[PDB]
Design a protein around this ligand. Structure first.
Ligand SMILES: CCCCCCCCCCCC[N+](C)(C)C
Length: 491
């Protein structure tokens, strides 16, 4: 599901049009809604009419109206393309997702810039680019045409930049002869597989798009200023890449494991799932960026014992909890720790709550975890329970967030051979992914100094390849920039 079925700037009327005139029954597209930001609409054609299904994400997962909850839009679409009869209209009424109505718009492509000059394209390609780096810009010469600028090189023996005219005639694109493509993306994909060769020998390889998101950490404030009056655009360009991350989640799908998941369709990747060698399943993934994380869901009553098996096995010594046990009347996490001073056995695992320390935003619980029957397997696990995450959106004071983050960091660093830092919320991808990504970026700055490069979208995509949908919303996306900005500007 190459997110081509996602149309980043399109009306409801435009969508109906497109489906009726360019589609058939079973055609579908996804669009960001303008009843409200953060909400998507899945527009589907059936019986010659178009229906619109709402999809909300308030930060925890994608909530399909009248359907199930999903980690990403790609994972939602993949599910319903392989599960006909499941997507229902007004009770029972099977809506079918058959044929993705693709988008011709290049706007959210990593290689598309437009509004860009030949000499400026050269600057950027010489500044940040390498061999095979490319981009497509609008032609300032003949207005409506496009230009493909490519760095050919080799250290990577710098060398050269080439510009290839792309002509646009009767709403099709070509490079001067040969095939005429319906979209810039089709042109680029075609010459990605069939590299244009120069009359003289040079092969114009399109390897990777020009990086436009990596900044110097010291300059993040200027970047944030630039984005504050286009955060949305950089987010959508990251979203479009999630189609690359549809890895298998077989184990979480097994019958014996179904009810060990808080949300049926929000599962851990097989290739990074935490495997319990002590039945072998828990809805949790190792996140490897030296400090690593386990990103996991809040306990269900029947996974409390497996959670402590995991903490013990993985030698985790710090837990970060980013949710109340219940919010808005719903249960986000069952209490998996004893009351202060109490001792409990959770299966073969025994834990005592040694002491609780209350701060304003969080409560720290000093827990001692051992295997029942085996003294001297005991270790302290420090549960940092963050209590003040708001019901809507994200924290609005970077001070307390960064105080909490710094404390959690320094606890982990003081413990010899501590294992992954366990982080969880409700589904374990939204608030969890946001914390982890911030902590990773701030770890980069804290080690390499304020002069280092950081790349926020790239770091997120790297983490999302290890667990589905890490970082859920645009609000959380912006919050990552704000947190790193504050950290930088308090140094
Ligand atoms: C208006 C400025 C907004 C700044 C937002 C700061 C980051 C909020 C999300 C991370 C909180 C992680 N946490 C709380 C668990 C440590």
């Amino acid at each position: 599901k190459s997110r081509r079925w996602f149309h980043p700037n399109i009306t409801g009327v435009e969508a109906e049009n497109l489906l009726l005139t360019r589609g058939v029954d079973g055609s579908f597209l996804a669009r960001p809604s303008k009843s409200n930001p953060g909400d998507l609409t899945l527009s589907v054609r059936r019986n010659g009419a178009v229906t619109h299904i709402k999809i909300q994400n308030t930060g925890d997962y994608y909530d399909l109206y009248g359907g199930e909850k999903f980690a990403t839009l790609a994972e939602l679409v993949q599910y319903y393309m392989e599960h006909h009869g499941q997507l229902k209209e007004k009770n029972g009424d099977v809506i079918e997702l058959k044929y993705p109505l693709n988008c011709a718009d290049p706007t959210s492509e990593r290689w598309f810039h437009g509004h860009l000059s030949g000499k400026e394209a050269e600057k950027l390609l010489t500044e940040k680019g390498k061999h095979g780096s490319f981009l497509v810009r609008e032609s300032q010469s003949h207005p409506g045409d496009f230009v493909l600028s490519v760095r050919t090189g080799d250290n990577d023996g710098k060398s050269k930049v080439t510009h290839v005219m792309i002509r646009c005639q009767e709403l099709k694109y070509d490079v001067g002869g040969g095939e005429r493509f319906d979209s810039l993306t089709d042109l680029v994909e075609h010459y990605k597989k069939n590299p244009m060769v120069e009359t003289l020998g040079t092969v114009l390889q399109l390897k990777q798009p020009l990086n436009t998101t990596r900044i110097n950490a010291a300059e993040i404030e200027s970047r944030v200023r630039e984005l504050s009056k286009g955060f949305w655009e950089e987010f959508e360009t990251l979203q479009q890449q999630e189609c690359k991350l549809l890895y298998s989640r077989k184990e979480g799908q097994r019958q014996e494991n179904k009810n060990k998941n808080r949300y049926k369709n929000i599962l851990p990747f097989d290739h990074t799932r935490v495997v319990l060698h002590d039945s072998d399943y828990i809805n949790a993934n190792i996140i490897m960026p030296k400090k690593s994380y386990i990103a996991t869901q809040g306990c269900l009553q029947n996974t409390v014992n497996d959670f402590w098996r995991m903490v013990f096995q993985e030698n985790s010594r710090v837990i970060v909890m980013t949710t109340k046990e219940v919010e808005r009347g719903k249960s986000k996490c069952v209490k998996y720790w004893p009351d202060e001073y109490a001792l409990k056995e959770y299966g073969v695992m025994r834990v005592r709550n040694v002491k609780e320390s209350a701060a304003h935003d969080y409560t720290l619980r000093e827990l001692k975890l051992s295997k029942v029957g085996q003294g001297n397997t005991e270790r302290t696990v420090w549960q940092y329970h963050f209590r003040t995450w708001p019901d809507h959106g994200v924290p609005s004071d970077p001070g307390g967030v960064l105080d909490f983050l710094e404390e959690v960091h320094h606890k982990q660093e003081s413990i010899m051979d501590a294992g992954p830092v366990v982080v969880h919320c409700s589904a374990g991808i939204g608030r969890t992914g946001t914390f982890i990504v911030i902590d990773i970026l701030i770890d980069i700055i804290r080690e390499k100094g304020v002069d280092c490069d950081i790349d926020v979208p790239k770091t997120i995509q790297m983490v999302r390849s290890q667990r589905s949908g890490m970082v859920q919303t645009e609000a959380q996306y912006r919050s990552i920039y704000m947190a790193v900005q504050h950290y930088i500007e308090t140094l």
